[PDB]
Design a protein around this ligand. Structure first.
Ligand SMILES: Nc1nc2c(ncn2[C@@H]2O[C@H](COP(=O)(O)OP(=O)(O)OP(=O)(O)O)[C@@H](O)[C@H]2O)c(=O)[nH]1
Ligand SMILES: Nc1nc2c(ncn2[C@@H]2O[C@H](COP(=O)(O)OP(=O)(O)OP(=O)(O)O)[C@@H](O)[C@H]2O)c(=O)[nH]1
Ligand SMILES: Nc1nc2c(ncn2[C@@H]2O[C@H](COP(=O)(O)OP(=O)(O)O)[C@@H](O)[C@H]2O)c(=O)[nH]1
Ligand SMILES: Nc1nc2c(ncn2[C@@H]2O[C@H](COP(=O)(O)OP(=O)(O)O)[C@@H](O)[C@H]2O)c(=O)[nH]1
Ligand SMILES: [Mg+2]
Ligand SMILES: [Mg+2]
Lengths: 55, 430, 427, 430, 427
């Protein structure tokens, strides 16, 4: 209710705008590498699961 | 912003719910205390300082299940008002859970759900969980839904319920409760998803590699489906699908709303490392009878409109290539009046894995909900079991003594019979 | 001083329109902050066609963005050039789209209709002259298809003389993103035929086919598809913005290509589209462009011209080139393919030359043609609509909004008559 | 400047008053001895040097309760002339506390209040506390009011009385005393507020999490309302409401003056960590039957004009939004005439707490006093209890023996009957 | 030398005036201590209009403060500019307001009125000339609605020639802060129609709507609303204080705008207003001010002009601008929108220009209009009065002060006659 909201809200939306531009850019890089797009896998962190099941 | 409310009825509803809220808090990045070490608004509220609170209400008529949450790790997350526990359960009796004991607590619950909806500025739907065989799941669920229908009117009431299995059963009075609750849900529920334990039990053994599962393994599977369905409201994507879009595209008529569930890939970590799981692969796995979460084969029936949800680094081209290939498959039928037959969505946020979890951390996944006439197979099985018991009046005295009038037993039988007639006429073509 | 007002509706319109301003801003030389940092004086000659100037050297586009849900809007501002637009032209609702034509037309359209028209009134009455408007929308959805048609009537009522140029995307034959498209497309056609002056039809499947056949893109995204469409929109208005040896603006195009009021649906194509490996083999000559434009594969709409006959054809050329060479090619292609033209109209090919080309390309061409091949695309949706309507279907979703069942019958009757009209003029 | 006089009679009135003056003295910063370690003058007189004295008169016909204050901590605060004590109590007999014993001390009492009114230059009201069941609360309460009407005339006389509960009762002759006192309050009082122990008891368990409250916990709840009511005369604010503005807004007629009260938020410390308590929620919690301080259901009747009083960082903007939201509630019934229906007050001083208190310290709080036809439900209960006793003349000999004439018993029944008629006449259709 | 006397009665009037003196003092450059420290000689030309000078370079306003309870007087005393006013001008009672029209007009008004009128008399007789009076009050309260009418009748008795311009705030249509306003406003309307020459109506709700829609202020306190209203008072009398190309004082406005003796209620507005951060998108010119002034959303009263028709309108312009530009804009807006203006009055729009704009703006404008749309507002209060009066209801509190029930019927009769008079002239 009580706030300066618009002066705070502008900063909130500016952070959101910058947030989306980062994840847009890094998504673009990993997309253009068509091995990761069609076929790739997270082979390192996937292995950590297997030793857990052994334990 | 845009809000969804979850209500958890009965032992099954509570047990599913605490697994689900573990998935969401770990997904967004919230500690069990509610603190932090975005889309929080869709499921949570900000209390002040830095603490969050879920939009959920837990209801049961006996305290054992709810008190586990009260002494569990997540006791600090929930508002004490959200956890509602009765004094003595309905004893798998629909009449006891509807008339005698259900009305002792109904108005206490309706205040708390209504009060929570005040905090939801942009409310767009509810999520409600059941187990049909239980007294509270069927009896109190009907009373909750009937009241909620007139209280709020045109708001999407989505349900996620557990069908009795075709052969696996834990209650003898199980057929009695399911049919009586069938009448109440058909007119009031906007759309209700179907799953059964026996199909889930077979899936977590073959696809996931577990010799001997428990209810925890099955319930974590259900949470993935709810996570994928609601991801369109929470995270960015190339093709958004709101609750209303789901409701319009899936159901051709008001009475035919029941979908069935599917999810892919469901694979163990070592076999996930063995294969590569492209978009065409996961779409193919959805349509096999083995992956269906309800133990009814679609090949006995035909398909109406199906809805696809894709999560990960999936590109709109690879989706169109995959779905067209499925149309070429002559092991899949479509009724003639649905040539389009599909609704697709693409979202960028991969699924979330859990410590001690069962599924692999794959980077592209798909979720499926389809409307099929094969569900009439499940209706016929429940009908036959009910007739054998009711012909000789095997358990009537318990329900009548708890306020139920006997005339409701044939009425619920006829309403189910009318529902079976609708599917057969829809299944025909001209 | 022939200002044009731009309106974007729905998810399709906002993403196509947002990419559209990236093309024009770089063509004129406007920094994404809105300041002129160009390289030629000719750019500032006629930037008034699309922009207003804020005191300070900052230029603002004449853009109005419309949607029923604000999800797509914040994706636009997240874009690089999103800061350019005027904040108050962002007009949006607080309800789901519904993917429903009736819901957009009756329930949510009326509430937003009054607010949108005044936003239109600000930009329409702030300029010395107004030639026409420019609408970008798709027909398969519920927002751009539904609310777009309602706004098209109001624009015609208030401003009859002005050119209501619209660009449409038609639902695809093979794989499509919506079940209820035959209902949405059939109802929308009634409003387009009677209200708008010029309609350009784009099919998504042809855009994919061009990418894989010609451009050899291994992984095409919606950015590459929308880049192709923006070129045609840029080409048509280039005669307004830059000098040329033979001028041809919008009103010339409507007069020449449209022989009768209802026959104004068009197909487009763009040349040269060069494969990244064929560039070293292709010598850029004026006849080389002529081959690509009239080639059937280059058409952006999945209707084969060879199956029908042409009524009129128009080609736009950009760059300094010979006037004799351009005029000779129109004669050559007309006389060598006489079986695809109507007898009772001589000189079916219109031509134009504009002096300034797009960046990087030393010559380019644009094609706009009108043909009887459209009977294919409308027969397609009519067949699907009939089977979906012979039995009732999702229809109850539309009836519960206020739409009467008689409207579907009127929608098909007008759509059917346009198919027969093209059948008649083939003779 | 502007002044209010507080009078405390009987056990119930003086025991509440002890809690009230603790709350005021702590709020203004005055030690219990009357020294300091503004609004001070609205409730206190400055004797000189640096010592403060309240405007209060303590009277009961038996010395036990007053001697607790004379021996307690606050013995140094009061002026001993104010602490007035009789010899033997009324024995829960109306006729004894009005005619036989009450007259020994009435003229001594009236001198002290009048003497206290001389020092007060700008008085605007009185604050009188009663319990209807008691002989001193009702018999001596009626006698005090009758004189103050002729002594002072046109000065608003506001009362705070504990109405008998539906089921909870501590005196068998309680219904007899209430009806006899009912006649006196309706004619002389300018406006009298209703409270009851049974609703307070249920309020101080559910909202404030107390297993087993006492009379001490209830008295702090009442003191907050009076402090909230009089804060408009003491503190700064955006919208000020005087006693007379209260008087014109709430009452449309002469005999319809009785309001009912509410307060929000009443929350415990460990629940306040979960809740936002913005202006929407605090206004929505006011209208629930759970929060009302009289165990009578508002939905059984309709509403006349209501008054809302706000305490905290509240801006005039969204209080209008709160009132607009309330008017959309179809569960809230308003009378067609008086379509405005509200007066709102905003004052900026937040609520005050007490060490060892029960109420959480909150940003902002709202106090509600409203006029509704639901209070005829309270009168109908008391009327039925009276008729059973008087049919067989159950206790009349005690009252007759102490001077009372029997003719009063049907007359007091007649007056209460007329009052019940008046409310249903107004509550009827326009 | 056209001095004006200012009177503040009630809570609403007092706080508006307190902000209103901050606006003038900054515009003239008077230190809060009452001393001159400004920057231009032109400020000292005609300061005599609003201020008196105390020997020593200390400037004192012609202000008189009135209330029935001392609460607001102490609030102003602690204000930033509280020391400015003359201490002997503070006149107040020692009783509660009561929110009662009859109590304020009859019971407490009479004792205060004889002192208040003499307080007026020292200042009104002290100056070389006196053109008119200036009163700020509400029309829903008990002090402003009642006592303001009483003083207005007395001032008319003593000073018949002078212009009795008042500034009033009307109770809101949707949410209002008092149960018994319809009684108060109806009784006050009888007095204002016959005694006051100029009445400007302002609604609190339109002030909030302007705050969100244009100013974006998430929490508008009463400071912003009073400042917006203070702009209009400053604009109207600015022609007296500063030179210009075309002077238009109060009496010029009365003769132009008012066609008949009883139709003299006005709606007001101001331009330009700054959208936070979005001012960088706007190129302010004279045509842009015209757009805001005749935009219906910028009206400070919640009565829609488009549902009625205009009789007269007047616009002031402040700053160095072209006179042809002003006169062309008034003609443009009148010709383009003929439907809303009356035929039997040609040239419905008056115009004026002033040289010196306010601080912070290189140009500004003020709009005053008179329209038939006031019938919407008076229907509102008459309806609530009718259904309250039939039941009788709260009359019990006015009768016990000495007001006959006959006065309610007379008050409605004159109010309804005013509504009919606007109905008839629409033909
Ligand atoms: N999938 C799944 N089903 C469950 C789970 N727990 C119980 N069920 C199902 O629930 C049914 C038994 O009813 P309850 O779980 O007790 O539901 P209820 O409404 O609380 O019934 P009452 O105990 O009588 O109140 C059985 O058919 C189980 O299959 C669970 O954790 N996961
Ligand atoms: N809220 C509240 N009520 C009280 C308190 N003490 C007594 N009461 C109420 O007082 C009511 C009866 O009035 P009495 O106790 O007889 O007081 P009285 O007016 O002095 O009557 P006598 O003692 O006979 O002279 C009971 O129903 C109690 O509920 C208290 O501390 N707080
Ligand atoms: N060519 C093209 N088509 C798109 C784009 N975005 C979405 N579409 C398609 O446009 C069709 C209709 O979109 P929809 O969301 O219903 O638009 P709306 O209802 O008017 O808001 C869908 O089938 C999408 O696949 C784009 O950027 N380019
Ligand atoms: N614009 C504005 N309105 C106010 C202010 N204070 C109060 N009001 C409004 O004025 C109306 C009546 O004022 P009131 O207190 O009765 O004035 P009174 O006649 O002197 O008692 C109320 O509805 C308030 O909403 C203020 O500071 N600014
Ligand atoms: Mg249970
Ligand atoms: Mg006693």
């Amino acid at each position: 209710m009580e706030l300066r909201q618009h002066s705070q809200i502008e900063q909130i939306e500016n952070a959101k705008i910058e947030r989306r531009r980062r994840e847009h850019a890094e998504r673009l890089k990993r997309i253009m590498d068509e091995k990761n797009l069609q076929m790739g896998m997270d082979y390192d962190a996937l292995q950590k699961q297997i030793d857990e099941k052994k334990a | 912003m845009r809000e969804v409310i979850s209500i958890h009825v009965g032992q099954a509803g509570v047990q599913i719910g605490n697994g689900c809220w573990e998935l969401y808090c770990l997904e967004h990045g919230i500690q069990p205390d509610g603190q932090l070490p975005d889309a929080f608004n869709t499921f949570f509220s900000e209390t002040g300082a830095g603490k969050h609170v879920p939009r959920a209400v837990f209801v049961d008529l006996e305290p054992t299940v709810v008190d586990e949450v009260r002494t569990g790790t997540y006791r600090q997350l929930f508002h004490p008002e959200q956890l509602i526990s009765g004094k003595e359960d309905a004893a798998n009796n629909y009449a006891r859970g509807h008339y005698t004991v259900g009305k002792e607590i109904i108005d206490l619950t309706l205040d708390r759900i209504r009060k929570l909806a005040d905090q939801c500025t942009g409310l767009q739907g509810f999520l409600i969980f059941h187990s049909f065989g239980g007294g509270t799941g069927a009896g109190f669920g009907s009373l909750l839904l009937e009241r909620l229908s007139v209280d709020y009117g045109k708001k999407s009431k989505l349900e996620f319920t557990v069908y009795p299995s075709p052969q696996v059963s834990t209650a003898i009075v199980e057929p009695y409760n399911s049919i009586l609750a069938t009448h109440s849900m058909i007119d009031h529920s906007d759309c209700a998803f179907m799953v059964d334990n026996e199909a889930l039990y077979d899936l977590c053994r073959r696809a996931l590699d577990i010799e001997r599962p428990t209810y925890t393994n099955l319930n974590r599977l259900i949470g993935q489906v709810v996570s994928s369905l609601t991801a369109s409201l929470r995270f960015d994507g190339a093709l958004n699908v709101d609750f209303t879009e789901f409701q319009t595209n899936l159901v051709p008529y008001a009475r035919i709303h029941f979908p069935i569930c599917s999810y892919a890939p469901v694979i163990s970590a070592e076999k996930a490392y063995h294969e590569q799981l492209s978009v065409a692969e996961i779409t193919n796995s959805l349509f096999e009878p083995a992956n269906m979460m309800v133990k009814c084969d679609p090949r006995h029936g035909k398909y109406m409109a199906c809805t696809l949800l894709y999560r990960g680094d999936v590109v709109p081209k690879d989706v169109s290539a995959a779905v067209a290939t499925i149309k070429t498959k002559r092991t899949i039928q479509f009724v003639d009046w649905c040539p389009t037959g599909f609704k697709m969505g693409i979202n960028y946020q991969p699924p979330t894995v859990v410590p001690g979890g069962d599924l692999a951390k794959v980077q592209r996944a798909v979720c499926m909900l389809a409307n099929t006439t094969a569900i009439a197979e499940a209706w016929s099985r429940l009908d036959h079991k009910f007739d054998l018991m009711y012909a000789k009046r095997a358990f009537v005295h318990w329900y009548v003594g708890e306020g139920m009038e006997e005339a409701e037993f044939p009425e619920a039988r006829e309403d189910l019979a009318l529902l079976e007639k609708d599917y057969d006429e829809v299944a025909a073509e001209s | 001083v022939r200002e044009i007002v731009h309106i974007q509706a729905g998810q399709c319109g906002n993403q196509i329109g947002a990419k559209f301003w990236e093309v024009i801003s770089d063509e004129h030389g406007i920094d994404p902050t809105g300041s002129y940092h160009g390289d030629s004086d000719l750019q500032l000659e006629r930037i008034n066609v699309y922009y207003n100037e804020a005191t300070g050297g900052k230029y603002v586009p004449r853009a109005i963005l419309v949607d029923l849900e604000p999800g797509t809007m914040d994706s636009v501002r997240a874009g690089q050039f999103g800061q350019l637009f005027r904040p108050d032209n962002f007009v949006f609702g607080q309800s789901g789209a519904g993917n429903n034509w009736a819901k957009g037309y009756y329930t949510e359209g009326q509430e937003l209709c009054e607010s949108i028209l005044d936003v239109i009134r600000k930009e329409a009455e702030s300029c010395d002259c107004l030639q026409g408007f420019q609408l970008v929308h798709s027909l398969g959805g519920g927002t751009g298809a539904g609310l777009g048609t309602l706004l098209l009537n109001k624009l015609r009522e208030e401003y009859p003389d002005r050119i209501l140029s619209t660009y449409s995307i038609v639902p695809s034959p093979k794989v499509s993103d919506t079940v209820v498209e035959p209902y949405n497309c059939t109802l929308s056609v009634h409003q387009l035929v009677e209200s708008a002056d010029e309609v350009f039809c784009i099919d998504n499947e042809a855009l994919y086919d061009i990418c894989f056949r010609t451009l050899k893109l291994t992984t095409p995204t919606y950015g590459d598809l929308n880049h192709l469409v923006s070129m045609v929109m840029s080409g048509t208005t280039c005669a307004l913005r830059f000098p040329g040896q033979l001028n041809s603006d919008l009103r010339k195009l409507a007069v020449n290509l449209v022989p009768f009021p209802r026959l104004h649906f068009f197909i487009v194509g763009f040349a040269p589209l060069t494969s990244r490996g064929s560039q070293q083999y292709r010598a850029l000559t004026v006849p080389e462009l002529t081959s690509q434009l009239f080639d059937n594969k280059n058409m952006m709409a999945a209707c084969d011209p060879r199956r029908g006959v042409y009524l009129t054809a128009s080609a736009h050329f950009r760059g300094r080139m010979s006037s004799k060479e351009v005029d000779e090619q129109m004669l050559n292609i007309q006389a060598r393919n006489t079986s695809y033209f109507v007898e009772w109209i001589p000189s079916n090919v219109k031509s134009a030359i504009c002096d300034i080309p797009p960046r990087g390309l030393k010559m380019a061409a644009t094609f706009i043609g009108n043909t009887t091949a459209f009977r294919e695309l409308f027969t397609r949706v009519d067949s699907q609509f009939q089977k979906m309507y012979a039995r009732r279907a999702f229809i109850h979703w539309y009836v519960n909004e206020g739409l009467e069942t008689v409207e579907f019958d009127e929608a098909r009757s007008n759509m059917t008559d346009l198919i027969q009209e093209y059948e008649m003029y083939e003779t």
